[PDB]
Design a protein around this ligand. Structure first.
Ligand code: MG
Ligand code: MG
Ligand code: MG
Ligand code: MG
Ligand code: MG
Ligand code: MG
Ligand code: MG
Ligand code: MG
Ligand code: MG
Ligand code: MG
Ligand code: MG
Ligand code: MG
Ligand code: MG
Ligand code: MG
Ligand code: MG
Ligand code: MG
Ligand code: MG
Ligand code: MG
Lengths: 145, 204, 64, 61
RNA sequence: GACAAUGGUAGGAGAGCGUUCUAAGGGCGUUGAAGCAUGAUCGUAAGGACAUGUGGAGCGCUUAGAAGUGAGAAUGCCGGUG
RNA sequence: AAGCAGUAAAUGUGGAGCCGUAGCGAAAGCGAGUCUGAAUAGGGCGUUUAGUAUUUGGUCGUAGACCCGAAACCAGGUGAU
RNA sequence: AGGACGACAUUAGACGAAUCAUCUGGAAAGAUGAAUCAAAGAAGGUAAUAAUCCUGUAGUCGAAAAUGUUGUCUCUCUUGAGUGGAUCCUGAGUACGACGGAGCACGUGAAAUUCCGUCGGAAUCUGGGAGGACCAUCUCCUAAGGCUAAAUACUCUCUAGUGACCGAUAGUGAACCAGUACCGUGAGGGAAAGGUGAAAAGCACCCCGGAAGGGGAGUGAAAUAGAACCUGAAACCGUGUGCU
């Protein structure tokens, strides 16, 4: 491309709409605000969720539940993701991070049964699904917590 | 396969430049974004106006609200007033934006590829200058038969080459690291030293 | 600045997989004598926030 | 400008709270009592807080 | 080629005109730039030329970028003159 | 990302962090399922792919937030020619 | 607390490459042709738009004196380590508690942690404090005495620069003898107002007129550039005229 012949990609750029710039635009005068009322005013409107004095939804409905301080979340790897590793490879939490199967470790790595393991592997993980453990054993791989 | 020419203009040999770096079909969409981004970064954005609050005075209400027969007014520094504050004028800001790294690398390759396609890429064995002389460099460009706007690329900063070519109009000297989309796009031709060409190929 | 979440709504709703909001049910605090067993049993089961309600309150729970 | 000579204890500011949690600024003053004590080896009357006077830390002339 | 639609307020959608600045390219100007004035010119509109007078040194065009980007009314503000 | 280098640049480097790849449940927890339930019943929410980064446009929030206009409120001063 | 010597920097400066001719014009930097320099083609000025005319620029050089920074000597100050478990020491009206407040993102709450007023009031290394009521355990610290650079904030100011910032109703209120004129008892409020020409060459002289003002003459490229003297819109006010 040349600086005298620069061209944007098609659909990449559209011009902005300018209100209060004459009738022919269709956004002159009222500027798309209609006629009078609270919202026609500058900085005019209602806070989102305000229903004009009717009890709001998030006041009429009840609060529920609590958050556990000791809640543990495990990074989950399905059987299909383990397939990438060559048969007989020792799958470990460290390897998974290096492979890029897991980015954030969280509390630990938990193997889950979704998908099918097609390669025999020695898998070491903090937790395993019942299905996952059986699938690794079926391939002849050994699962270790 | 690009021929390497001595500064005299006689062929020194042949260098191979990677197809990915200098052969990819140019992406004009990415290239446009890169050029726009670089131009935005150059902007200073030091532009300011004074709003009604900023303008001097204008605290007191000019006259009583009713009875005068005048229009109701609250300050002499209101926007409709002469010497009044500016409503929503320019404010100091940055125009700089970022794009993904992969696209930045593509834009460079696309610009370099465009050069190679137009025969704008010339490879020279080396630029050897003991001292800075503009006339000598001007002769080199004439022997190389380079156009008015030329980008000379060195592997690493060369003091003599930069000094020599500084005052020549249309000629810009860069290093392989310093290569940018604007410079490559602006230049009609690119003269790259053999060492620089390899370094560019390695980087991109 | 950063937009602020509506803390009361966050305390009262949970987000599903499809981006819907699970909600608890009103009329479940007291006065259970005045309510039927079928009412009480069915009011126990949760519902989703309505589409019309979502339109009004979607920005309140963007971060949720 | 009234403080304990020994401890430097002085009035503090805070809020008076109603049952409705309405707040009005108030002061807590030190229990300062004018007592003759030895200052610079000469008997002098100065304001001293009762806390300081307790345990005979401040001699009274 | 055939035939079908095209009144319109709030309002939604689209395509454009013009202004100032910037980049790049290519141009104009004391053998007269911009501005101003006049005319029987051109385009579907916003608007664009051309000639002449005045003027006396800057200014278009193409493409892209960015906006203090368009006034007839606010008992609007300031100035001038009825 | 901050940072660091660089020309107030592009850019390079920086993987901390963020989002997605799994959901369900108040939670313990379990997992292509989970919760409810005595249920292996029924039902709710899920599974049987596409996201993410930057940016044009639209809209919203927070900022005076399209522009002009009160009567008033408060604080500190100045006044008994 | 000082001293000596050196270096660097700041506060004046110096040198610093390269163009002539022709055409138009009042004037050349323009155009045209032929050259030249460049570590200098930033910029401003010069009778129109100049890398080579001027001031400069790159580069290089320079300080009697004063100041700052810094280096090296000098000077000043000064022991550094183990082993032992008997005894001693290790910050008290303190910690802490109650009550009333406040501060902690945390509205008295289950309220830890931390401050204040009032009142009461420990322990002592087998001590004491903390880990969000509290207790036990475990773990980490060692209050109630001080000092401490850098990374951080800001800009009245100075120096050098920059702007897809303004260009005289804009930009500072203020491009100008402006916080002035003016207004107010005072606190205080608060304007308007830039442009002859390249050069002043700023109209000798003559004519009308008391003067003002004007007509010539002359200066100038231009006076329809003659003094708030570039350009000179509209409103508005006239004079004449074709049609009515
Ligand atoms: Mg449009
Ligand atoms: Mg309409
Ligand atoms: Mg209108
Ligand atoms: Mg209206
Ligand atoms: Mg109505
Ligand atoms: Mg309405
Ligand atoms: Mg009237
Ligand atoms: Mg102003
Ligand atoms: Mg229509
Ligand atoms: Mg629209
Ligand atoms: Mg405007
Ligand atoms: Mg010279
Ligand atoms: Mg000449
Ligand atoms: Mg208390
Ligand atoms: Mg605890
Ligand atoms: Mg002004
Ligand atoms: Mg003007
Ligand atoms: Mg003014």
């Amino acid at each position: 491309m040349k600086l005298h012949e620069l061209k944007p990609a098609e659909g990449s750029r559209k011009e902005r709409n300018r209100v209060g710039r004459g009738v022919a635009t269709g956004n002159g005068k009222t500027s798309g605000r209609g006629h009078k009322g609270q919202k026609a005013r500058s900085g005019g409107g209602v806070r989102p969720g305000f229903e004009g004095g009717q009890l709001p939804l998030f006041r009429r409905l009840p609060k529920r539940g609590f958050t556990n301080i000791n809640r543990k979340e495990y990074a989950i790897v399905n059987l299909d993701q383990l397939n990438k590793f060559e048969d007989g490879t020792e799958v470990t939490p460290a390897l998974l991070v290096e492979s890029g199967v897991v980015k954030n470790e969280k509390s630990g790595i938990k193997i889950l049964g979704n998908g099918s393991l097609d390669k025999k592997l020695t898998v070491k993980a903090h937790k395993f699904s019942a299905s996952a453990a059986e699938a690794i054993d079926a391939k002849g791989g050994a699962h270790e917590v | 396969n690009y021929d390497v020419l001595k500064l005299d203009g006689t062929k020194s040999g042949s260098i191979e430049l990677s197809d990915a770096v200098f052969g990819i079909e140019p992406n004009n969409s990415v290239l446009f974004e890169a050029i726009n981004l670089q131009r935005a970064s150059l902007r200073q954005g030091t532009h300011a106006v004074k709003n009604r609050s900023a303008v001097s005075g204008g605290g007191r209400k000019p006259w009583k609200q009713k009875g005068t027969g005048r229009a109701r007014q609250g300050t002499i520094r209101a926007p409709q007033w002469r010497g009044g504050g500016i409503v929503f004028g320019p404010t100091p800001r940055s125009y700089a934006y970022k794009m993904p790294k992969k696209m930045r690398r593509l834009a460079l390759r696309s610009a370099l590829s465009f050069k190679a396609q137009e025969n704008g890429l010339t490879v020279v064995d080396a630029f050897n200058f003991e001292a800075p002389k503009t006339k000598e460099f001007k002769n080199v460009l004439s022997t190389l038969e380079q156009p008015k706007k030329v980008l000379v690329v060195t592997e690493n900063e060369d003091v003599n080459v930069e000094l020599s070519a500084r005052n020549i109009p249309g000629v810009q000297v860069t290093t392989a690291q310093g290569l940018n989309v604007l410079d490559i796009t602006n230049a009609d031709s690119l003269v790259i030293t053999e060492a620089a060409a390899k370094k560019v190929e390695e980087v991109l | 600045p950063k937009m602020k979440t509506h803390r009361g709504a966050a305390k009262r709703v949970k987000r599903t997989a499809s981006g819907q909001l699970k909600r608890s049910r009103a009329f479940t605090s007291h006065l259970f004598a005045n309510k039927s067993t079928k009412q009480k049993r069915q009011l126990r089961k949760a519902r989703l926030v309505s589409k019309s309600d979502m339109k009004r309150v979607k920005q309140l729970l963007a971060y949720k | 400008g009234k403080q304990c000579f020994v401890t430097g204890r002085k009035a503090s500011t805070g809020n008076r709270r109603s049952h409705a949690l309405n707040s009005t600024k108030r002061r807590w003053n030190a229990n300062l009592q004018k007592v003759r004590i030895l200052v610079d080896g000469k008997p002098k009357k100065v304001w001293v807080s009762a806390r300081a006077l307790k345990s005979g830390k401040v001699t009274r002339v």
